[PDB]
Each structure stands twice: as C-alpha cells, then as structure tokens.
Amino acid sequence: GSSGSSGVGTIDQLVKRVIEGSLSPKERTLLKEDPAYWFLSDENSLEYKYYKLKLAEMQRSGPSSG
C-alpha cells in the first residue's frame, strides 16, 4: 500500500491467520505491541468488533467442534 483510509481490512486478514495458525503463537501477542492493532485493547470500537466477530465465525466454521 501507500496511504489512504482503512476499513476493517487488516483484521479481516489477521483473524484468518490466528484461525489457520498460519501465524506463530507468539506473533499474536506481539500484534498488541504494534500500533496497527491498537483497538485490540479497546472493545467499544469497530476494528475490534471484527477481530472478535470474524474470529467467532471463522473459529466455529472450519475445524471440528461439536
């Protein structure tokens, strides 16, 4: 990229990772140490509404559970 706006674009991708595990276990924790994932701590936001949502749907749909 270069610049502009950001509409829940990163999360949509990030989540997928933590789901498929494509990303190491430590990397996740590091995400919080990054500014791009500031909403992480926040809850009354939109960017955070995905990481928690997209994850709930991505977690249930896919691997065995039930």
- Structural domain boundaries in the chain: 1-66
Q: What sign for the dihedral angle of Cα 38, 42, 46, 51? A: positive
Tokens describing residue 7: 């509409």
In angstroms, the CA 44 to CA 40 distance is 10
Phi first, then psi: give them for residue 46, nearest 5 degrees.
-90, -50
Write out the chain in H/E/C secondary structure. Answer: CCCCCCCCHHHHHHHHHHHHCCCCHHHHHHHHHCHHHCCCCCCCCCHHHHHHHHHHHHHHCCCCCC
Q: Under CATH, what is the fold of the domain 1-66?
A: Arc Repressor Mutant, subunit A (1.10.10)
